[model samples]
Target: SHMELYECIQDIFGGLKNPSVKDLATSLKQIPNAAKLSQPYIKEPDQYAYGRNAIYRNNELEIIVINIPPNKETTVHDHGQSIGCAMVLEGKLLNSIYRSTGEHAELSNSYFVHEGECLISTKGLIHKMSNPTSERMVSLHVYSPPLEDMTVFEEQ
Candidate 1:
């Protein structure tokens, strides 16, 4: 199933010259039911767990599996200039978006992503991800041009 999904995605990616975030998200949504859902690829951290496992990568695209433990959250951050999207494989997560004001970052919006759902963030979109439930969460993320780093924010 993993390879099936990967090949399906590769086929889609091959047709597009430079796919947009919307394009990727839409294609991910169309992933066939034959593609079985899988667990997180990395081991969960013991405390404040936030794990990352690379699943696939190339010059123009990269895929990763992330695990987030309950009650844990990431610092508000922006993925430099990368366009990315993530599909939830298990549990749920909260995505809180922010915008820069004159002196600080301001909360712009927030949403919950549940299993089988997905979310997209364009380049420079500042957001924080959290596993708010008592259970663990797993997600598959795909980024175009790969994410090398991010700008972390102190705010939440």
Candidate 2:
């Protein structure tokens, strides 16, 4: 089944001659169960940090698998020009939204995307992802235009 899903993913990329953010969102919906059964599901949680693995990449798009352990969270960051989405497979994820002020980014809101849910970003989005539960959180992230660079905001 994993093989079939990966094959399907390849087929998806095959058709995406020029992938867009909308195209990536549609592709993410096509492979929820596949994301659960593959990488993050099989791999053990890493110590003190989440596991980030790039499963597929091309000039138009990139797909990655992330396995976040309990109490682990990422720094405030922005995906630059790439619009992206993350679909959770197991446990829960706390996605905190931030707004940039002078010299630093400030937290404005926070929400939880439970298992089988998704969190998407538009251009200029600044946020952080964390696993707030005792169980590990597994998710699949897809970015269009291949995420050229990311800005990780430092504390002021």
Candidate 3:
């Protein structure tokens, strides 16, 4: 069950460090089984629908599960921690990772330098994910020490 998978992941997360990513590149391997139970959770109200995150937060971190409708584009944001990881249990998405160059002077200061159409975030890297297709989107995300007080990257 999707909820069960979250529970397993939370169990694993109970022990870890702030600057480390546990799942590495294949952390999403458990999704095949996780997706089997996630179907009942997707909510589509109109031509588009999304599910709010089930948040687990504290001094450790804030983990949220966000479900997006088809063709949704999320604003580019950053995880202040060293890394963040994700696994797609349901649909595929186009993710673009940005690096801070410290030149927040113009709208294009940030570079769309790295890209991957993926079901997981290799090494728990920081990035922005958006759906460009006509299908609903669902994914599992893990943030190192969880994401609290993290600043979104700005195009300077």
Candidate 4:
């Protein structure tokens, strides 16, 4: 229900589309404030369950600031019906894109970068992100129309 989610987005961005996801992600200059908007799930501002923190909200699209700890990784998962866009701001991020073509999943693309790297995917793309370095990793994510519950996938 993007109509229901649009309200959240409007409150955050004042009903304006900021060109591309990169532009939207970089809109946040620091943690706890993604593009001038503050987030609520910053409880574990240090290391959230997903391995990071920041200011974000569930709008027509999700605005999030993810903080990844050193040597930590998020489980492979899909956005369900939502599309996702990610951008690295600080530290390094390793991306593992997987394709489920048979009984099992296979790796498709492996990407690594420090700052200024961006990735966008449509719904149903299975992938994982990791901060392999000893230092912390920071990134931003925007989910189309926002997300309620993430549907995760894993290897059998």
Q: What are the Cα lDDT values of the candidates?
A: 0.76, 0.77, 0.51, 0.61
lDDT of 3 by residue, 17-68 (tens): 4534545324434444656545454444443245646445445544445576
Ranking by TM-score: 2, 1, 4, 3
Question: How do the predictions measure up, each by TM-score?
Answer: 0.83, 0.85, 0.63, 0.67
CA shift at 136, candidate 1, in angstroms? 0.9
* Candidate 4 per-residue C-alpha lDDT over 1-156 given as tens digits, one digit per residue, 9 for 90 to 100: 333323444544445353345444443322332322322332243544454542445445566667777887887777777667776666798988888755456678878966665677666787888888898776667776576666566554
Looking at model 1, the pairs that clash are none
Per-residue lDDT value at 114 in model 2: 82
Clashing pairs in 2: none
Candidate 3: where are CA atoms >4 Å away?
A: 1-3, 17-19, 22-27, 39-50, 55-62, 99-126, 153-156
Which digits, one per residue and each the tens of the lDDT, describe model 2 over residues 1-156? 445656867876656766655666677677647654565334554543677777778887787778888888887888878878888877799999988876588897899998767888877889999887998888888887678888988644
| 1-156: candidate 1 lDDT, tens digit per residue | 455655766775545556788887876777664225344255566444587777777788877778888988877888887788888777799999999764357889999998878888888899988998999888778788788887777662
Backbone clashes per model, in order?
0, 0, 5, 5
lDDT of 2 at 149: 87
